Amino acid sequence: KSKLPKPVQDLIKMIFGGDPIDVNYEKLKTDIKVVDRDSEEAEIIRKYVKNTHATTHNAYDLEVIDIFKIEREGECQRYKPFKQLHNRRLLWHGSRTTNFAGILSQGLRIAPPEAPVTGYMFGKGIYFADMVSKSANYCHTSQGDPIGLILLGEVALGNMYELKHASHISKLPKGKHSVKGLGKTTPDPSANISLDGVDVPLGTGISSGVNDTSLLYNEYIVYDIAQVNLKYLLKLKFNFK
Ligand SMILES: NC(=O)c1cccc2c1O/C(=C\c1ccc(C(=O)N3CCn4c(nnc4C4CC4)C3)cc1)C2=O
Ligand SMILES: [Cl-]
Numbered sequence: 001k002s003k004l005p006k007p008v009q010d011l012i013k014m015i016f017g018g019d020p021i022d023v024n025y026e027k028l029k030t031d032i033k034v035v036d037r038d039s040e041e042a043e044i045i046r047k048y049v050k051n052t053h054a055t056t057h058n059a060y061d062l063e064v065i066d067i068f069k070i071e072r073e074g075e076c077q078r079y080k081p082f083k084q085l086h087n088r089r090l091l092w093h094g095s096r097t098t099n100f101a102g103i104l105s106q107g108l109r110i111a112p113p114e115a116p117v118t119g120y121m122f123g124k125g126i127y128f129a130d131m132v133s134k135s136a137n138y139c140h141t142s143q144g145d146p147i148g149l150i151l152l153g154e155v156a157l158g159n160m161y162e163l164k165h166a167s168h169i170s171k172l173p174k175g176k177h178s179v180k181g182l183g184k185t186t187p188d189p190s191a192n193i194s195l196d197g198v199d200v201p202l203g204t205g206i207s208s209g210v211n212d213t214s215l216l217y218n219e220y221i222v223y224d225i226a227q228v229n230l231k232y233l234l235k236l237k238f239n240f241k
Contacts, residue, residue, distance in 0.1 A: 007034045007066045011235060014147065015100045028104040031071040035232070042067050044195055045152070045232060048090075048202040049132045052187055054217055055205070057133035063237040065147070070233050072107055079229040082156035085177065090200045090231065091128035091220055092135030093151040100149050100233075108153065108228050121166040122179045125221035126228055128155055130187050130201045134217050141238040152232040154198050155222060164213035172223065182210045183217035198231075 002009045002021040009021050011032065016024045025032070035042050046064050053062060082088075095103060111124045120127070129135040132150070139148030158177025161169070169179055184207065191203025205217075222228060 005034055008032050008068070011066070011068060011233075014097060014149070014235070015104075028101065029073040030104040031073075032233070033069045035067040035069050037067075041069070041195070044193065044200060044202070045234070048152075048200060049234070049236075051191075051202050051204045052092075052131045052133070054131045054133045054185065056216060057131075057137060059241045060141075060238040062132060062136060063239065064234055065237050066235040068233040068235070070104070070230055072104065072230055075107060075229055078107075078226045079154075079156070082158075082177075082227050083229075085156040085158045085227075087157045087160065088198050089130070089155055089157055089220070090152050090195060090198045091130055091155050092132050093126070093128050093153055094135035094138035094148070095151075096138075096140050097147075097149055103151070104230075104233075107225055107230065108151070109225055110223065117168065121181055121215070121219070122163065122221050123168040123170065123223075125169075125179070125223045126225065128153065128220045129217060130220070131183075131185075131205065131217045134219070136236060136238070139236070139238070141236075143240045146238045146240065148236050148238060150234050150236055151230055152234070154229040154231050155220060156227040156229075157220060157222070160220075164210065164215065166214065169221075169223070177222070177227065179221040179223075181215045181219040181221070182208060182213050183215045183219070184208055184210065184213055185217055
């Protein structure tokens with residue numbers, strides 16, 4: 001009775017634990033398309049995964065099962081103020097499978113005003129990595145449950161407030177659009193690629209040459225939900241050490 005392509009049906013099943021597949025699909029308010037395995041997009045994405053897995057995160061390997069291109073209703077319009085902003089980057093965001101119904105239906109949101117701050121170095125915002133594994137850790141996948149989901153969002157970073165140490169940012173300095181936490185390791189900046197006019201930092205990790213930083217790896221934080229345009233959802237296989 002589902003009229004969806006099988007990979008999308010299996011995505012839906014995964015995301016929703018009673019209701020028919022197609023009705024649960026509609027709840028996501030998200031256009032979802034299978035990216036062809038042997039397409040240019042899929043190649044770039046598999047490379048991003050391949051190259052940006054941190055050496056510190058060696059309890060598992062990642063295999064891309066399916067790549068989905070996703071279009072949240074309303075997001076094109078919402079993102080529009082930032083679509084020409086400079087320094088737009090394709091970055092990872094990992095979360096538990098059980099969050100993905102909410103995430104797709106309502107977009108990535110900032111943690112609510114009253115949630116606890118532990119876990120967040122730079123206050124309540126939306127957090128992204130340029131290292132797939134840093135984000136993939138937040139899938140809270142296990143031996144027993146080895147399949148997880150991760151997003152690639154276009155993030156309008158603009159002028160980044162670049163910090164090495166934890167600071168609960170209540171208000172960005174004038175002219176800044178985002179915070180970047182500076183890691184000791186960074187994808188090779190010379191190996192950046194452009195996909196649909198969005199920078200993809202898929203170079204292998206090199207020393208950043210940033211001294212006295214508390215972060216191993218970069219992270220990027222936006223404080224306005226409108227600065228995020230979700231693009232891809234990957235179904236990943238975690239193979240454990
Ligand atoms: N998620 C990422 O890809 C990511 C990337 C880079 C840095 C950070 C990232 O997540 C960060 C923090 C973080 C991520 C997750 C959590 C986490 O486990 N939380 C508990 C429950 N929870 C939270 N958000 N949604 C939920 C579920 C109940 C509805 C907070 C706490 C903190 C970073 O500092
Ligand atoms: Cl973690």
